[PDB]
């Protein structure tokens, strides 16, 4: 039962991370990974909870997050999944760190209280 202030804040963070301003490095994180189409057929030997920014935005809009900590964890999972499958130094790994850098900056503005 997340409240309006927390909801608006979260949607704002997700909207920021998906915005075209970051298109040159956020495009791997906008939609669900498709292992076969991306020629990474072993993706789900490394990842067991897929998450992407579009999915966080849908769960948000469907009132599926109880509170801000829960939302933060789904967003953070996008990047843990990235590093679980893409080694250091690869392009997608580095894109993930750059987008996470922005997430870290934006998330520190969160309301102290996750209203209900």
Is 41 part of a structural domain of the chain? yes
Question: DSSP for 28-81?
Answer: GGSS---TTTTT-TTHHHH-SS---HHHHHHHHHTT--SSHHHHHHHHHHHHHH
Is 116 part of a structural domain of the chain? no
Is 113 part of a structural domain of the chain? no
Is 114 part of a structural domain of the chain? no
What sign does the dihedral 93-95-80-49 (CA atoms) show? negative
**Overall domain count for the chain:** 1
What domain range includes position 17? 4-107
Phi, psi of 83 (to 5 degrees): -75, -25
Within a 13 Å sphere around the CA of 37, how many CA atoms are in the beta-carbon half? 5
Cα→Cα distances 59→15, 65, 98, Å: 13, 7, 24
Is 94 part of a structural domain of the chain? yes
The CATH code of the domain that includes 100 is: 1.20.920.10
Cα→Cα distances 18→25, 42, 60, 78, 85, Å: 10, 26, 14, 13, 21
Is 103 part of a structural domain of the chain? yes
Resolution of the experimental model, in Å, one decimal? 2.0
Q: Percentages helix, strand, coil for the chain, rounded to the nearest 5?
A: 60, 0, 40
Is 65 part of a structural domain of the chain? yes
Is 115 part of a structural domain of the chain? no
Q: From which experimental method does this structure derive? A: X-ray
């Amino acid at each position: 039962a997340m409240g309006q202030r927390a909801m608006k804040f979260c949607q704002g963070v997700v909207r920021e991370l998906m915005s075209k301003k970051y298109a040159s490095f956020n495009y791997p994180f906008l939609e669900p990974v498709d292992p076969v189409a991306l020629n990474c057929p072993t993706y789900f030997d490394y990842v067991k909870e897929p998450m992407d920014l579009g999915t966080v935005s849908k769960k948000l809009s469907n009132w599926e997050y109880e509170n801000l900590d829960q939302a933060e964890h789904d967003i953070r999972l996008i990047f843990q999944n990235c590093y679980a499958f893409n080694p250091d130094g690869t392009i997608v790994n580095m894109m993930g760190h750059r987008l996470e850098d922005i997430f870290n900056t934006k998330w520190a503005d969160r309301p102290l209280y996750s209203d209900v």
